[PDB]
Scaffold this motif. Structure first.
Motif, mmCIF file in Angstrom:
data_model
loop_
_atom_site.group_PDB
_atom_site.id
_atom_site.type_symbol
_atom_site.label_atom_id
_atom_site.label_comp_id
_atom_site.label_asym_id
_atom_site.label_seq_id
_atom_site.Cartn_x
_atom_site.Cartn_y
_atom_site.Cartn_z
ATOM 1 N N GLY A 1 -0.055 -10.874 -9.823
ATOM 2 C CA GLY A 1 -0.188 -10.968 -8.381
ATOM 3 C C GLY A 1 0.724 -11.995 -7.769
ATOM 4 N N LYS A 2 1.699 -12.445 -8.544
ATOM 5 C CA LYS A 2 2.504 -13.600 -8.198
ATOM 6 C C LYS A 2 3.846 -13.283 -7.575
ATOM 7 N N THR A 3 4.233 -12.002 -7.577
ATOM 8 C CA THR A 3 5.530 -11.596 -7.037
ATOM 9 C C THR A 3 5.321 -10.701 -5.821
ATOM 10 N N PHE A 4 5.537 -9.392 -5.978
ATOM 11 C CA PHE A 4 5.381 -8.442 -4.877
ATOM 12 C C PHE A 4 4.415 -7.327 -5.244
ATOM 13 N N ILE A 5 4.205 -6.390 -4.321
ATOM 14 C CA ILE A 5 3.169 -5.396 -4.525
ATOM 15 C C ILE A 5 3.655 -4.388 -5.577
ATOM 16 N N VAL A 6 4.976 -4.232 -5.687
ATOM 17 C CA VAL A 6 5.588 -3.383 -6.709
ATOM 18 C C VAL A 6 6.800 -4.088 -7.263
ATOM 19 N N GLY A 7 6.841 -4.196 -8.594
ATOM 20 C CA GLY A 7 7.982 -4.796 -9.264
ATOM 21 C C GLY A 7 8.161 -6.278 -8.965
ATOM 22 N N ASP A 8 9.353 -6.777 -9.244
ATOM 23 C CA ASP A 8 9.601 -8.204 -9.040
ATOM 24 C C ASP A 8 10.565 -8.436 -7.895
ATOM 25 N N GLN A 9 10.762 -7.407 -7.056
ATOM 26 C CA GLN A 9 11.554 -7.525 -5.823
ATOM 27 C C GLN A 9 10.771 -7.000 -4.586
ATOM 28 N N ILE A 10 10.989 -7.629 -3.440
ATOM 29 C CA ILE A 10 10.289 -7.240 -2.231
ATOM 30 C C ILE A 10 10.690 -5.802 -1.868
ATOM 31 N N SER A 11 9.767 -5.057 -1.258
ATOM 32 C CA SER A 11 10.058 -3.688 -0.799
ATOM 33 C C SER A 11 9.534 -3.511 0.611
ATOM 34 N N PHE A 12 9.869 -2.383 1.242
ATOM 35 C CA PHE A 12 9.358 -2.126 2.569
ATOM 36 C C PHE A 12 7.852 -2.068 2.591
ATOM 37 N N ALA A 13 7.244 -1.655 1.484
ATOM 38 C CA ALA A 13 5.810 -1.588 1.391
ATOM 39 C C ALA A 13 5.201 -2.980 1.485
ATOM 40 N N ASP A 14 5.882 -3.997 0.974
ATOM 41 C CA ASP A 14 5.364 -5.369 1.153
ATOM 42 C C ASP A 14 5.267 -5.774 2.608
ATOM 43 N N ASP B 1 14.305 1.329 -9.443
ATOM 44 C CA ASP B 1 14.583 2.632 -10.044
ATOM 45 C C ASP B 1 13.690 3.686 -9.404
ATOM 46 N N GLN B 2 13.743 4.916 -9.912
ATOM 47 C CA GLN B 2 12.929 6.004 -9.356
ATOM 48 C C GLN B 2 11.419 5.852 -9.564
ATOM 49 N N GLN B 3 10.972 5.288 -10.688
ATOM 50 C CA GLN B 3 9.529 5.097 -10.883
ATOM 51 C C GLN B 3 8.971 4.060 -9.905
ATOM 52 N N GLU B 4 9.658 2.931 -9.754
ATOM 53 C CA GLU B 4 9.253 1.938 -8.764
ATOM 54 C C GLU B 4 9.258 2.524 -7.364
ATOM 55 N N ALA B 5 10.244 3.349 -7.041
ATOM 56 C CA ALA B 5 10.280 3.948 -5.717
ATOM 57 C C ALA B 5 9.033 4.769 -5.469
ATOM 58 N N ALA B 6 8.593 5.540 -6.462
ATOM 59 C CA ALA B 6 7.364 6.302 -6.262
ATOM 60 C C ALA B 6 6.159 5.378 -6.043
ATOM 61 N N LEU B 7 6.104 4.261 -6.764
ATOM 62 C CA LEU B 7 4.963 3.335 -6.628
ATOM 63 C C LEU B 7 4.990 2.656 -5.250
ATOM 64 N N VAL B 8 6.195 2.367 -4.773
ATOM 65 C CA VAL B 8 6.390 1.856 -3.411
ATOM 66 C C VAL B 8 5.836 2.841 -2.403
ATOM 67 N N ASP B 9 6.203 4.117 -2.549
ATOM 68 C CA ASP B 9 5.612 5.168 -1.705
ATOM 69 C C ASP B 9 4.076 5.216 -1.783
ATOM 70 N N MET B 10 3.539 5.154 -2.988
ATOM 71 C CA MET B 10 2.101 5.234 -3.148
ATOM 72 C C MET B 10 1.392 4.111 -2.402
ATOM 73 N N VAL B 11 1.955 2.910 -2.465
ATOM 74 C CA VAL B 11 1.430 1.776 -1.709
ATOM 75 C C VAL B 11 1.570 1.963 -0.204
ATOM 76 N N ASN B 12 2.751 2.361 0.236
ATOM 77 C CA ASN B 12 2.918 2.558 1.642
ATOM 78 C C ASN B 12 1.998 3.652 2.175
ATOM 79 N N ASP B 13 1.843 4.739 1.436
ATOM 80 C CA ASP B 13 0.958 5.837 1.872
ATOM 81 C C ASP B 13 -0.494 5.321 1.963
ATOM 82 N N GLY B 14 -0.914 4.479 1.008
ATOM 83 C CA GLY B 14 -2.217 3.839 1.092
ATOM 84 C C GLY B 14 -2.347 2.933 2.305
#
Ligand SMILES: [Pt+2]
Ligand SMILES: [Pt+2]
Ligand SMILES: [Pt+2]
Lengths: 199, 197
Positions: free
Chosen positions: A129-142, A72-85
């Protein structure tokens, strides 16, 4: 293939997007540049007649088109925050490798664990810490974080010993079948990490 | 509602402030005098808490429809914004680590760093609209800020670039943005923190 990666014969800024493509079963062509461009730099990436520059642009584009940008949109922002880091730390890493390796490396490695800890902390807050860096699905940030961690393990071996969720995360992502095969492949192994011999 | 937490400088919040103001949004400034990356701005959108100025821009981009008309345009938005942030990282490094001994070289190289944006405008409806497509995107606000701070660093840096010059004028004249840019809340903040510009 509708995908082309145009880059130097290095892993560099293409490592993560390549892992992403390999892991999601996508086909692509590699175009190699031996020592025109919007910002006078590679990677250049073709997706049909769409020409992109900027590794993160490519990651986000693949993230959007292959469904690896959160649920969703909230996870997308968290994905961005990780990638930017991830990219903030990459910018320092690149400066090191290319402008101050011998003199800076001990100062860089000193500061490393405090720059890694934020990712450990993110992991500890997402299902243990058992799934992915954001949510329960892999993202580009992973894939990008995975790359960053893999290249830092070469620069400063053991740098993950202090961080158990990050350690297990790397081992877990690395063993994904399609990704494990790719990381072992000559296409990956026989390229150097950077274009100056240092790592 | 929206909260922006940051130092009393324009800095990394200027672009996202221009966006909020121009999109008729309301927000709270929490001024800090001293987190996930030990960094600001911190941004709150309801229960959601974000760090990193470009994360905030993309979020608002996504939630307010300022991220292109489709996936192809979204990628071009990202490309522009990433190019803006590459130059911004250079600019910031100049300002904070080498202003007086680097400034000469920086400004000599500057036309080469700006030209790609003139070229993008040139390839999009003759530079008469926005940096990507027919609608404003979060990238327009970021590029505008880059261009404004560079006119302060090196006045006339845009004289050689008619599309970018007209673009700053057009965007700056948008009613809500015009009012915000003239406001004390913007005018009376320094661009950076160390008093250099
Ligand atoms: Pt940088
Ligand atoms: Pt960089
Ligand atoms: Pt930077």
């Amino acid at each position: 293939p509708p995908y082309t990666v145009v880059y130097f014969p290095v892993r560099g800024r293409c490592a993560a997007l390549r892992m992403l493509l390999a892991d999601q079963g996508q086909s692509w062509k590699e175009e190699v540049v031996t020592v025109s461009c919007l910002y006078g730099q590679l990677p250049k990436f073709q997706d049909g007649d769409l020409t992109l520059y900027q590794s993160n642009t490519i990651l986000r584009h693949l993230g959007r088109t292959l469904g690896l940008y959160g649920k969703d949109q909230q996870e997308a922002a968290l994905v961005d925050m990780v990638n930017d880091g991830v990219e903030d730390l990459r910018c320092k890493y690149i400066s090191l490798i290319y402008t101050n390796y011998e003199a800076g490396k001990d100062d860089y490695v000193k500061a490393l664990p405090g720059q890694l800890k934020p990712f450990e902390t993110l992991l500890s807050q997402n299902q243990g810490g058992k799934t992915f860096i954001v949510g329960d699905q892999i993202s580009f940030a992973d894939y990008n974080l995975l790359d960053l961690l893999l290249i830092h393990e070469v620069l400063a071996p053991g740098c993950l010993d202090a961080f158990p969720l990050l350690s297990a995360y790397v081992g877990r992502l690395s063993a994904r079948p399609k990704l494990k095969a790719f990381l072992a492949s000559p296409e990956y192994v026989n390229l150097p990490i950077n274009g100056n011999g240092k790592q």
